[PDB]
């Protein structure tokens, strides 16, 4: 069997090939404890500390999956624009230290298109770390148009904490619970202004603290997800998910943009906000030319799509030639990845 290790920004999703649900999702935070829930190795999608990523991968193979990595070929997920070298230290560790029989590296997003069932388009990937919009023509991204937004849920959960403390409810300590609020209550509007005017206290949902103290959130329900579309809230000048998708679709060829516009697939747990589809429908249908046909696609299983897109690849009889064998590695080195994994 094969193993699929999506070392993500906040959670690592692992499982096997053929399956349809990560059999193990654990926070990637590292004599050493690298717990499922108990510093951060991958900061913004690029692995800053490698001596502690060995560990995320130790818990992955030996403790969460109880699998000896010596016998399973390993699929791995990189991020768009991994610094080239960081690809190199992924071929190294897996064969030199983990002695795997084989390996493959893929972009976290093409893989999301394959789970939306397509292989030509633009993907918007959000996560607890970087949010990137990645244009992919024919399975391979266009690296000159992959755009990066350094906004994610972390920044966003912390914004909710400000806005509720200001309301009156304070969360001083590590967790005095706002993530639950972020994904159980918050939504994205079509028009922030309409929803801000709505005197009604009807857009208020209430929840229980541990002890039974129920607090109420409203207004904040739709501002948190908006930091994404108007990040000046948080002190930023990068313009938002809506237009970043266009700015890229516009640094590409006139000839391929008909396809990219009709295939904008949302991925990431930062898109599980209800309403992130139609806002961007509004906001890209406006900026786009008027003769364009559009379909923003949000598959319902977007939380673990990068992984799902990996099972698919590994469930393919034809993906058995695309594995970097160790035999090959010993000769060239960690630079076979640039020659076999594009």
């Amino acid at each position: 069997a094969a193993l699929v290790i999506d070392n993500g920004s906040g959670m690592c999703k692992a499982g096997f090939a053929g399956d349809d649900a990560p059999r193990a999702v654990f926070p990637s935070i590292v004599d050493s404890y690298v717990g499922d829930e108990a510093k951060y190795p991958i900061e913004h999608g690029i692995v800053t500390n490698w001596d502690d990523m060995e560990k995320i991968w130790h818990h992955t193979f030996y403790n969460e999956l109880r699998v000896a990595p010596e016998e399973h070929p390993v699929l791995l997920t990189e991020a768009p624009l991994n610094p080239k070298a960081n690809r190199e230290k992924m071929t190294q560790i897996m064969f030199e230290t983990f002695n795997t029989p084989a390996m493959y590296v893929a972009i976290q997003a093409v893989l999301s298109l394959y789970a939306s069932g397509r292989t030509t388009g633009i993907v918007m990937d959000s996560g607890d770390g970087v949010t990137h919009t990645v244009p992919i023509y024919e399975g391979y991204a266009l690296p000159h148009a992959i755009l990066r937004l350094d906004l994610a849920g972390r920044d966003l959960t912390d914004y909710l904490m400000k806005i509720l403390t200001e309301r009156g409810y304070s969360f001083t300590t590590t967790a005095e619970i706002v993530r639950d609020i972020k994904e159980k209550l918050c939504y994205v509007a079509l028009d922030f202004e309409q929803e801000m005017a709505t005197s009604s206290s009807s857009l208020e949902k209430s929840y229980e603290l541990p002890d039974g103290q129920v607090i109420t959130i409203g207004n904040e329900r739709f501002r948190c997800p908006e930091a994404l579309f108007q990040p000046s809230f948080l002190g930023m000048e990068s313009c938002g998910i809506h237009e970043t998708t266009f700015n890229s679709i516009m640094k590409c060829d006139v000839d391929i943009r008909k396809d990219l516009y009709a295939n904008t697939v949302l991925s990431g747990g930062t898109t599980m906000y209800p309403g992130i589809a139609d806002r961007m429908q509004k906001e890209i249908t406006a900026l786009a030319p008027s003769t364009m046909k559009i379909k923003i696609i949000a598959p319902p299983e977007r939380k673990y799509s990068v992984w799902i897109g990996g099972s698919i690849l590994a469930s393919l009889s034809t993906f058995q030639q695309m594995w970097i064998s160790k035999q090959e590695y010993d000769e060239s080195g960690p630079s076979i990845v640039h020659r076999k994994c594009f």
Binding site: Q321, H338, R339, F342
Partner: protein, 335 residues
């Protein structure tokens, strides 16, 4: 084995790719025959692929391998029709060649086959101190400022090949990652990834009858023909007149022509054959042979390093385009 029994299922394979892919099959099944493979390397560079498609298919009878191979290739070869618009393994092989062609001018550090031409191109309107780039710098000057046109035009009037260009509708600029490989996304080995430039989009009017791109369909993307090569000649004609008395001139001229050849394929202005199909012209060849210059137009002896880098490239574009389409089945068999 099955791999190539799949990479030869590209509904987008062109003649160029077959050659690379098929020698790969032989190089691992067979393993002496290496000379044949070299011929296969030369015919490809010189674009006599046909001979080569035949020769691989004839060599699929001498050494009879696995019947997969023998029986496989023969059914795909005739359908192969080359496109100078989507020929890409040739772009990697051509853009990577100029790198080798230039490693060898770096080993001709005389760089003084260039000082004399300076004062010979300061006649059509700091010698080699920096190396090569100074000469890539002024090579352009030569052709672009010697004249936009109007001195090269009499030579062009003497040509019956220049009138046959096929270029057209400005389409725009596109920001790519390797120069000859105008295609932005061609899976690029990160071994060869350049800074993100902004590259032009050139368009082809196939309606100019007998257009170059119909005639030599193999040479990729050569909508036009090098117009400023004719004006390389004016500058070259003086040198030969002034320095015909130089003894080693074939070495020194070939140190210029070969550089134009490489830089043009290296910076993306043209392709081998667009620069070369002008130099192999009658009234232009006459100039050289009156001073006994026999030119070697960028044909090198180690063609191997580039060759493999191509077979493997075609291994990457195709297989992952073969799963690309297998997904396009398993989902259209879900929907």
């Amino acid at each position: 084995e099955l791999s190539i029994s799949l990479s030869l299922d590209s509904p987008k394979l062109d003649e160029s790719d077959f050659i690379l892919l098929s020698v790969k099959y032989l190089e691992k099944s067979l393993g002496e025959f290496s000379g044949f493979f070299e011929d296969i390397e030369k015919l490809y560079f010189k674009q006599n692929y046909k001979e080569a498609i035949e020769k691989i298919l004839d060599f699929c009878k001498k050494n009879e391998l696995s019947e997969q191979v023998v029986q496989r290739l023969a059914e795909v070869a005739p359908r192969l029709k080359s496109n100078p618009k989507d020929n890409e393994s040739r772009r990697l092989y051509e853009t990577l060649y100029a790198d080798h062609l230039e490693s060898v001018i770096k080993q001709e550090s005389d760089l003084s086959v260039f000082n004399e031409l300076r004062d010979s191109y300061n006649a059509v309107k700091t010698h080699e101190t920096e190396i090569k780039t100074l000469d890539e710098a002024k090579q352009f000057i030569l052709s672009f400022v010697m004249l936009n046109d109007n001195v090269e035009l009499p030579l062009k009037a003497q040509s019956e090949r220049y009138p046959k260009k096929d270029r057209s509708e400005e389409l725009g600029n596109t920001p790519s990652a390797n120069p000859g490989i105008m295609k932005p996304n061609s899976p690029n080995f990160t071994d060869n990834l350049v800074p993100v430039r902004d590259v032009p989009k050139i368009a082809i009017n196939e309606k100019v009858a007998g257009g170059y791109s119909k005639t030599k369909p193999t040479t990729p993307f050569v909508a036009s023909l090098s117009g400023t090569t004719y004006s390389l000649m004016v500058v070259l004609t003086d040198y030969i007149e002034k320095h015909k008395t130089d003894k080693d001139i074939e070495k020194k001229v070939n140190q210029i022509i070969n550089l134009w050849i490489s830089s043009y394929i290296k910076e993306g202005y043209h392709s081998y054959s667009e620069v070369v199909d002008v130099l192999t012209e009658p009234f232009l060849q006459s100039i050289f042979d009156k001073a006994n210059i026999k030119l070697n137009y960028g044909v090198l002896d180690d063609t191997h390093a580039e060759f493999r880098k191509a077979q493997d490239y075609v291994f990457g574009l195709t297989i992952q385009s073969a799963m690309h389409h297998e997904l396009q089945e398993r989902f259209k068999n879900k929907e």
